[PDB]
């Protein structure tokens, strides 16, 4: 005769640029894309903070700049482009200034627990990045299909 | 009291890449855009003519190639791109081998009646174009808004 | 006087983010002909379209319990004043957007 | 006395598309032709033609 068979599959753990736990976090609205496009799991620099109006003009991280926060994942604000989710010019952003988020990584080795995070020129985590941050790792280290992700603990500037 | 007013405005003569008159004309189907996009008011080139099936591979004019026909305006086959009417890669094209048509122009002086038509590298009519064509002018010379149009009589190759 | 001097419509539903409107045009000509002409002019047409977007605003305010009790016992509530300020801020921000615009938001 | 004329073209696919979307093209083309005739008559009345005397 025949022997019946059963299969089992486990879902992934996380997707790029999404929150990790329900710990204390502080997301910031009232942020505008001054120029260009911002990926969901990437660092963000502040070009200028308005005095009277109060909006903060943000931009993608570049060389010789201090990171401020990381964009997060939302199904309403984000625009569908480049086979992913991005924030377009002249639109609001949800930037996380504190908490734990799943970032994008160009690294190939698992990190430690309480070491400082280093970012490269385009705002993605790298083992030997030139840009130094005050954030620390959190322990999470997984990947989604062909995309590598890492968990990072952010602190307020 | 007041004096009534009445105004008067005349329509434009023609649009780029449209059949000028009802004289003897021939439009050839079974032509597929091998590569790139083709503007409506521009010439084409024959990359290859299949020996068994019958389809002719058409492409935009390049340096040192003989023109074969001019695309024709249609509200169904064409696809709107760059705020213009265009033919995309794949699909079918409508190129006329004989007749009269309005064509895109770059020259600034009105041409004579029975003179040969010269084309540039990109397939648009020009007074001093390098490419020499057996087609002759028809006398039509108009301008739609900011687009210059010229009427050209085509002959079968 | 932004809403007073300019018309107000109600087409868009709350959930939309964009809208579109279109226009059309035509060209043509005519000529004097004779018998056995075999040559006549032609006509055509065209059209275009455009787009737009939508935004969101918000603010907030705070109050404590002792302030509420003091307001109830003196005939001078503070919650009403704070809510009036909150609504006025929205109205003035809409007016600012209408008559001056914001460069970063395009 | 004199005489005037013009014409227009259309295919089957355009007709079917117009019937299936509620934006007929034949009506627009006919209106364009009639307007061209009226405007040419006005031009003859108010400006005249030199070659035709």
């Amino acid at each position: 005769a025949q022997i019946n068979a059963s299969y089992q599959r486990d879902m992934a753990i996380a997707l790029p640029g999404m929150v990790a736990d329900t710990s204390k976090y502080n997301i910031d609205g009232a942020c505008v894309v001054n120029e260009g496009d911002v990926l969901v799991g990437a660092a963000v620099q502040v070009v200028q903070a308005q005095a009277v109006d109060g909006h903060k003009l943000v931009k993608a991280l570049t060389t010789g700049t201090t990171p401020y926060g990381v964009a997060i994942r939302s199904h309403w604000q984000t625009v569908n482009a480049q086979n992913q989710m991005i924030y377009e010019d002249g639109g609001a952003i949800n930037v996380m200034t504190s908490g734990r988020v799943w970032m994008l990584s160009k690294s190939t080795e698992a990190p430690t627990f309480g070491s400082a995070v280093k970012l490269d020129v385009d705002g993605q985590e790298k083992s030997d990045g030139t840009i130094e941050t005050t954030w620390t790792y959190a322990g999470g280290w997984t990947k989604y299909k062909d995309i590598q992700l890492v968990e990072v603990q952010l602190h307020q500037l | 009291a007041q004096i009534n007013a009445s105004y008067q405005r005349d329509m434009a003569i023609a649009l780029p890449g449209m059949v000028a008159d009802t004289s003897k004309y021939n439009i050839d189907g079974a032509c597929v855009v091998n590569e790139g996009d083709v503007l409506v008011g521009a010439a084409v080139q024959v990359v290859q003519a299949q020996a068994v099936d019958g389809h002719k591979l058409v492409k935009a004019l390049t340096t040192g190639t003989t023109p074969y026909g001019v695309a024709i305006r249609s509200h169904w086959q064409t696809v709107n791109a760059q705020n213009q009417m265009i033919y995309e890669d794949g699909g079918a094209i409508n190129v006329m081998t004989s007749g009269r048509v309005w064509m895109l122009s770059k020259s600034t002086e009105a041409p004579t009646f029975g003179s040969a038509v010269k084309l540039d590298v990109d397939g648009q009519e020009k007074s001093d174009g390098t490419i020499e064509t057996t087609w002759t002018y028809a006398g039509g010379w108009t301008k739609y808004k900011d687009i210059q149009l010229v009427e050209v009589q085509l002959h079968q190759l | 006087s932004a809403l007073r001097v300019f018309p107000v419509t109600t087409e868009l539903s709350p959930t939309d983010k964009t809208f579109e409107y279109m226009t059309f045009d035509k060209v043509g000509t005519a000529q004097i002909i004779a018998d056995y002409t075999d040559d006549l002019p032609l006509v055509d047409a065209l059209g275009t379209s455009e787009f737009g977007k939508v935004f969101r605003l918000g603010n907030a305010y705070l109050i404590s319990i002792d302030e509420i009790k003091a307001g109830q016992a003196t005939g001078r509530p503070l919650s009403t004043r704070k809510a009036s300020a909150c609504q006025l801020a929205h109205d003035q921000l809409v007016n600012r957007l209408v008559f001056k615009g914001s460069a970063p938001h395009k | 006395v004199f005489r005037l004329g013009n014409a227009y073209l259309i295919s089957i696919d355009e007709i079917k598309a117009g019937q299936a979307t509620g934006r007929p093209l034949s009506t627009r083309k006919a209106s364009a032709c009639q307007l061209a005739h009226d405007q040419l008559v006005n031009r003859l009345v108010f400006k005249g033609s030199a070659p035709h005397k």
Binding site: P16, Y144, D146 | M11 | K17, T18, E20, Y21 | -
Partner: peptide
């Protein structure tokens, strides 16, 4: 290069206004 897009498309939140504008050409 995997697809990590959202759930809703751009045409699900979009409105086409009923009115259309047609230019006029006076006869005379």
């Amino acid at each position: 290069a995997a697809a990590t897009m959202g759930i809703w498309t751009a045409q699900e939140l979009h409105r086409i206004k009923s009115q259309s504008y047609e230019e006029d050409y006076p006869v005379g």
